[PDB]
Amino acid sequence: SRSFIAAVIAIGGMQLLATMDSTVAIVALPKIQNELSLSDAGRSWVITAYVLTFGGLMLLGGRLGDTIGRKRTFIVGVALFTISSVLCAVAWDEATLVIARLSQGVGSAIASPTGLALVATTFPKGPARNAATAVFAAMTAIGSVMGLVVGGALTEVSWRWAFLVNVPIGLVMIYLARTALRETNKERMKLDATGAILATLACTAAVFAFSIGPEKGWMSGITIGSGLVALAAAVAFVIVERTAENPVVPFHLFRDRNRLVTFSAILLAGGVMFSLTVCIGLYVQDILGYSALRAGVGFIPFVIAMGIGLGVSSQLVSRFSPRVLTIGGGYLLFGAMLYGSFFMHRGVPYFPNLVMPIVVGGIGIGMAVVPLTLSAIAGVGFDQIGPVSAIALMLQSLGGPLVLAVIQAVITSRTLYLGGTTGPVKFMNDVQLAALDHAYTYGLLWVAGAAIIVGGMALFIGYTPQQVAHAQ
Amino acid sequence: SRSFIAAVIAIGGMQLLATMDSTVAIVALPKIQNELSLSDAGRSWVITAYVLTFGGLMLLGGRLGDTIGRKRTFIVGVALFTISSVLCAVAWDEATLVIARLSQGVGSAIASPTGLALVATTFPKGPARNAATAVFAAMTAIGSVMGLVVGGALTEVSWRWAFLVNVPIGLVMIYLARTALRETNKERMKLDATGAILATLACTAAVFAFSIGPEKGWMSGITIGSGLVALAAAVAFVIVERTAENPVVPFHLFRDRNRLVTFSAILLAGGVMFSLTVCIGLYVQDILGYSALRAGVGFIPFVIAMGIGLGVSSQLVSRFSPRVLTIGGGYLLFGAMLYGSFFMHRGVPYFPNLVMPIVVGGIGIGMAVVPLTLSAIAGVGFDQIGPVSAIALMLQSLGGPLVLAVIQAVITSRTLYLGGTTGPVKFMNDVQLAALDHAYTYGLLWVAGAAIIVGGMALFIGYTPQQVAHAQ
Ligand SMILES: CC/C=C/C/C=C\C/C=C\CCCCCCCC(=O)OC[C@H](COP(=O)(O)O)OC(=O)CCCCCCCCCCCCCCCCCC
Ligand SMILES: CC/C=C/C/C=C\C/C=C\CCCCCCCC(=O)OC[C@H](COP(=O)(O)O)OC(=O)CCCCCCCCCCCCCCCCCC
Ligand SMILES: CCCCCCCCCCCCC(=O)O[C@@H](COC(=O)CCCCCCCCCCC)COP(=O)(O)O
């Protein structure tokens, strides 16, 4: 019973590490700017450096496990992330911080796609995989709330003390990764060098272009060149991949209708979840006036509700089709979002009108996450599990900003319509703050509509329970 | 004052009597079989005799009130129902019981469609009609539950005493109708004899064919002949109605999108409700093992929740359109149905697992019923309210068995699939009982899908609160 727990914790540790690091880096940005004397461009680049190498090197990270070994790749990625976090905590100027963030991104990109593949390969299909997927999904929310709590608590001493928290935890994971997991010593494949190079070039160019667009204006020299590089690399990669042994991206797997619908649903659902997280955090900290520590403490009921939902769904997936459970979770999520949209404003008490929608939405999200994760890794085999996991994780991470940009644009337009201001929150009055609150409650409706679209899309899955959650 | 209460009670009395008698007759079939020495055909015909003349003479009864008088027709129908209920108890052989059931069905068909017309033509549009509609919808469920209770607690001595409880209630409702309702003094109309005869023949032939089909077969000469006669009579009726002085069925009134969509929604909603009632009852006395009295006592919270929902909706219909209220009530009902499907099996305790879905579904049904039946009698006038009410009642009564057949076929198919058997429940062992449990909780999902379709189609009503629930 201890071996199973050690294995699942070791496999899911990297999700916790990455999410907590991202949340802490978001929280402690102004202190970094003040102490290190960075401009707005440097402040944005502190966050951009991580995502550049995180999104650039994810397909290569997915394919690398078949060449080196999934256990070894996982351990190497975790170790690189820990050492790079130490370098972040020790950094003394802007260049060193940027280099350390790039190294953190490289380590995360190496280690993250291997975790889902390890979930799929270590545990055979059945109850064990259901429990493993439930734990894998719970660790992400645990990391998010832990990051908020730590960032709020350590806002008085220094930002350098917040980067060191990754040093212990990561070490622990390494130990578990060296103890619970076993190596099957399978025959090693041959890496696809040209495909990996083209994929990394295309992904890095796309990420850089998307990040530099709003900052320096679109079609302003750098953006057009980066976009040209991205499209040329993508077209060359697509052409080359048609005749490559051990493809980085196996396209023939995407002919099945179920896989296409499932991956589209994964993309859009990840976008919806990211939009909810960011918008609700901003609303709580800005309008309601809660500090970071107060919000981190108040978000624990979300973790408990999500754990309950995951526990229920991991047992229900053995009898009900994934589409039914997805609709069941979406029902509660939609109800919670509507209640939050229509009964929220400044001065509202915490308990009656805040914790209830959070708990109901957490239960719904927990009930809906497990069937999607089980459908994402169904019927792939041991030769394409790596690329499939990498593609699924990449789609989930990519879907977020695209929806968040639309939601923020809608919120800004509604703020300007009602008579608001585009300045800082703490330079506003009562009427402008009321306009901002109404804009936020208006954008919640667009998030709900996106969730409705997600449910309508997931209504076409067609996977039977015997295919995803039953042992042969 | 007390006049309003007496009037609404007198108008809903016929619905209460019909539903209570139906439930009591269904409960006490085995005792009738044992005492009268009947075969399976006699058992089927005891139920079929009432339905034959109830569905045969609905359309004629909807127009009979114009040429004689609504109060007089109501009183005559209730009196005939009471007399036939008296004669049912004192029956010695099969023939007397069959003719008593036929006469009772004739009285019910005369009196039932006149109640809705009296609701429409007694209280002017506004709050009074909303309250009358709420009482009219509540008395149906009240009668059903009390009939279940009475049949459970009375059929342990004699089945003849079960048919005699109708008499005091019929007498008190006759007294209330005589002393509360008032004459109209409207000019008498002319009865369309040809159309009435053709409609009666068509409906009777259709009901007889649908009843005899499953017992004999789909290739029997009698069934094919009955269906052919029904189709020919329907065609002749449609041809005759083109140039009728006072048509039994006005076909021109249905040239509106609102009315057509409303009537389709009424049909499918009646089907969904009937399927829910029958399936829930069969599950309770079959799987959970409750007696008739226990189920009747346990279904009281449904009546209370439905009353609360009706009271809320009769007040809310003056501000919100019928579409919004229907969608909200259906949302609550769908949530209750999904909760029941997911977490229900033999051995669950009553308190945490039964009352909550029942209460939520009752609130949803009560909130959804009032706008639907308020929209069915909107903008017709005095000279066309009778046939419209008759058509609404007929569509509700017709929608039930259609959906119930599909649900029962699905349940039987999955019972056979999971290793169950077809036979009396008293003989099956644990495996086949679990197969029945899973089959019922699986058919609940099909009921929920039917509700989803009902809501999607009801999204196209288009009525406004001023045309439905606003006076003047
Ligand atoms: C998602 C689809 C992928 C499916 C997976 C598919 C394939 C495999 C691939 C990855 C598998 C591994 C990850 C699987 C879990 C990913 C989701 C996850 O667990 O995510 C957790 C996020 C971090 O992830 P992120 O959201 O950043 O993606 O953290 C939080 O939830 C912090 C706390 C938020 C607190 C507010 C939450 C309110 C919820 C209720 C709404 C209430 C609304 C009204 C309230 C008032 C409003 C006033 C305006
Ligand atoms: C319907 C649309 C027309 C609208 C009106 C249209 C036109 C006008 C014309 C008539 C207007 C006047 C009548 C209007 C109300 C007619 C419906 C009515 O009130 O009906 C009541 C029935 C009697 O009437 P009947 O339905 O027989 O016609 O009585 C019961 O419902 C007893 C209670 C049983 C239980 C059910 C409720 C479960 C709720 C929970 C569900 C989930 C539970 C899961 C548990 C586990 C399950 C495992 C399998
Ligand atoms: C008398 C009887 C009257 C009856 C009247 C009935 C009237 C109609 C009643 C309401 C009908 C039931 C209902 O609300 O169904 C929707 C419920 O799911 C949704 O909202 C979808 C939500 C999807 C969310 C997907 C993502 C979730 C997780 C995201 C993070 C991972 C689904 O609808 P659809 O999308 O069209 O399939």
Side-chain angles (χ1 to χ4, degrees), chain A residues 439-450:
Chain A
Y440 271 105
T441 61
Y442 175 75
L444 204 52
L445 288 169
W446 284 63
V447 182

Side-chain angles (χ1 to χ4, degrees), chain A residues 15 136 144 266 273-274 277 280 283 302 306 358 361 393 396:
Chain A
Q15 294 279 115
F136 194 86
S144 314
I266 282 164
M273 180 87 234
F274 192 73
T277 301
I280 288 184
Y283 178 87
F302 173 75
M306 209 167 148
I358 292 284
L393 205 68
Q396 193 251 334

Side-chain angles (χ1 to χ4, degrees), chain A residues 23 48 74 77 83 98 136 179 203 211 217 224 263 311 318 340 343 368 396 440 462:
Chain A
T23 312
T48 308
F74 195 68
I83 298 167
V98 162
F136 194 86
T179 288
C203 292
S211 74
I224 48 168
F263 275 48
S318 295
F343 285 87
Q396 193 251 334
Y440 271 105

Side-chain angles (χ1 to χ4, degrees), chain A residues 40-367:
Chain A
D40 291 315
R43 208 178 65 140
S44 71
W45 261 101
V46 162
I47 308 281
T48 308
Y50 174 88
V51 299
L52 192 74
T53 45
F54 177 53
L57 294 160
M58 185 179 288
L59 298 175
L60 172 62
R63 174 59 70 189
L64 190 63
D66 291 331
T67 310
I68 302 289
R70 281 181 187 85
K71 179 181 173 182
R72 186 139 64 219
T73 311
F74 195 68
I75 291 162
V76 162
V78 177
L80 188 60
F81 189 93
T82 295
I83 298 167
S84 296
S85 180
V86 175
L87 183 63
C88 277
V90 176
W92 56 87
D93 57 329
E94 194 182 340
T96 312
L97 192 59
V98 162
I99 294 179
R101 292 292 283 173
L102 289 168
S103 303
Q104 276 199 153
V106 167
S108 192
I110 288 179
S112 287
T114 309
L116 183 62
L118 274 167
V119 165
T121 58
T122 303
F123 304 107
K125 204 166 46 83
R129 200 182 272 190
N130 308 355
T133 45
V135 178
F136 194 86
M139 292 275 264
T140 307
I142 291 182
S144 314
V145 193
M146 221 189 276
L148 282 176
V149 169
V150 162
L154 285 158
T155 199
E156 182 65 26
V157 176
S158 197
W159 65 269
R160 296 179 189 262
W161 287 103
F163 272 133
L164 278 183
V165 192
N166 310 323
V167 189
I169 305 175
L171 280 165
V172 170
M173 296 322 184
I174 288 162
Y175 180 62
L176 285 176
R178 263 188 64 253
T179 288
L181 299 180
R182 284 85 170 93
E183 183 69 271
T184 65
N185 292 280
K186 198 64 179 65
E187 284 297 328
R188 297 291 185 269
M189 312 193 166
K190 297 296 289 183
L191 196 75
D192 193 44
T194 309
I197 281 174
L198 287 171
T200 56
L201 179 65
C203 292
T204 300
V207 168
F208 181 81
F210 173 80
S211 74
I212 193 66
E215 179 184 3
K216 216 170 180 179
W218 311 336
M219 72 291 291
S220 288
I222 312 292
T223 303
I224 48 168
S226 45
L228 171 70
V229 161
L231 277 296
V235 166
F237 175 74
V238 167
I239 289 177
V240 164
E241 265 308 308
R242 291 201 263 131
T243 188
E245 183 193 2
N246 292 320
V248 171
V249 172
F251 293 103
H252 44 277
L253 289 187
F254 292 115
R255 293 180 181 177
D256 182 51
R257 186 273 303 278
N258 298 356
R259 211 182 303 273
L260 281 176
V261 178
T262 311
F263 275 48
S264 297
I266 282 164
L267 172 80
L268 195 58
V272 164
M273 180 87 234
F274 192 73
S275 315
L276 283 172
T277 301
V278 171
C279 290
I280 288 184
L282 275 190
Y283 178 87
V284 158
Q285 280 181 233
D286 281 17
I287 301 301
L288 294 185
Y290 288 5
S291 58
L293 185 57
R294 277 176 66 89
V297 168
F299 281 149
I300 307 188
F302 173 75
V303 173
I304 299 172
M306 209 167 148
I308 288 180
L310 299 154
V312 163
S313 199
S314 75
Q315 291 276 132
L316 279 183
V317 287
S318 295
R319 195 183 139 205
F320 289 106
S321 185
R323 66 162 94 178
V324 176
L325 296 157
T326 305
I327 297 297
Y331 173 87
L332 296 169
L333 185 49
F334 186 58
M337 299 201 267
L338 294 174
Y339 176 79
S341 171
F342 279 112
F343 285 87
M344 208 78 218
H345 62 87
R346 184 176 176 87
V348 164
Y350 169 74
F351 157 71
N353 296 295
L354 199 48
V355 75
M356 281 309 126
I358 292 284
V359 160
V360 178
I363 291 174
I365 288 161
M367 284 201 39

Side-chain angles (χ1 to χ4, degrees), chain B residues 268-269 271-277 279-280 333-334 337-338 341 403-404 406-408 410-411 440-454:
Chain B
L268 294 174
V272 165
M273 178 88 228
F274 196 78
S275 307
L276 278 172
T277 298
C279 292
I280 293 293
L333 175 60
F334 180 73
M337 274 194 282
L338 265 188
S341 174
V403 189
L404 190 51
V406 187
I407 301 307
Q408 278 176 330
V410 167
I411 287 166
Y440 284 161
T441 69
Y442 176 74
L444 208 45
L445 280 177
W446 286 67
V447 183
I452 285 180
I453 290 175
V454 170

